[PDB]
Every structure is written in structure tokens, then in C-alpha cells.
Amino acid sequence: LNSNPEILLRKRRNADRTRIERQELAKKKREEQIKKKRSNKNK
RNA sequence: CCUUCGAAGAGUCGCUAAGUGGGUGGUCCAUCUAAAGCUAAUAGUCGAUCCUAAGAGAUGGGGAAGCUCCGUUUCAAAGGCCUGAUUUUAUGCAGGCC
Fold first, then answer.
1. How far is residue A5 from each of residues A2, A8, A9, A10, A11, measured CA to CA in Å?
2. Protein side of the strand B interface (CB < 7 A)
């Protein structure tokens, strides 16, 4: 039926949720690093 | 040749030791240095093959001089599977289930 062969890449699964999770993880890591940095002045 | 030094085998000898100590002999003396070691002279289709039954019997462990025996899940690290942007001082696997 007059077709043309090609290669197709399927969409990655759960990319947006992974992106949001990574953004949240980065924010949490920054915040906890700040917490521990200013918590070490009372040693 | 001179001078300054100069260790010695323990559950062993005899319950369990000693360092001019100790072992063995002789009617005080004689002789050796244990408890370490080496050294020559006609079938895809019928059966088996598969499964478990009573039971037998490895592994783990224990006994016995040993040929071997007991014990069958027992104070055994007895193995499979899944998830993840690649795992935050920068690319040396983290978590979970039975």
C-alpha cells in the first residue's frame, strides 16, 4: 500500500514525572545542605 | 694470641615442677643434657522417559584408630526475582519481596 520504510523512536515513559522528581530532589538537597551548614556553628 | 661478653625446648619432668638445674648409675663419686629436626653404606499418538507414594539417602554437623556410622532441616552466610533519568563533594550500586 505504497509505504516507505523508516525507523521510529518510541516516546520515553514517565519523563515528565522523573523531571519533576529530579527538580524536587535538587531543591531538597540544596535546602538540607544549607541546614547542615548553618547547624555546624554551635559545635 | 690479647680483651669485653656469654641465651639453652612445661600439661613437660615427676595432681603437676627446677636452674651452680635436671636424668641415669656406683658402693660422696661417675656419666650425659630430655620435653625440636635431617641424614648414605521401523512409533510425535503403544510403554520407558515426567511426577510423587511407603521408604531409602547427600549436603550442614557430630562419633569412631579406621574400613565408616548417626542424623533429613538441624543455632548452615544453603537463592531467585523486581524497581531505578546513572548512584549530589561528581560516573567504585542503591532500595525492595519471598
1. 10, 10, 14, 16, 19
2. A 14-15, 18-19, 21-22, 25-26, 29, 33
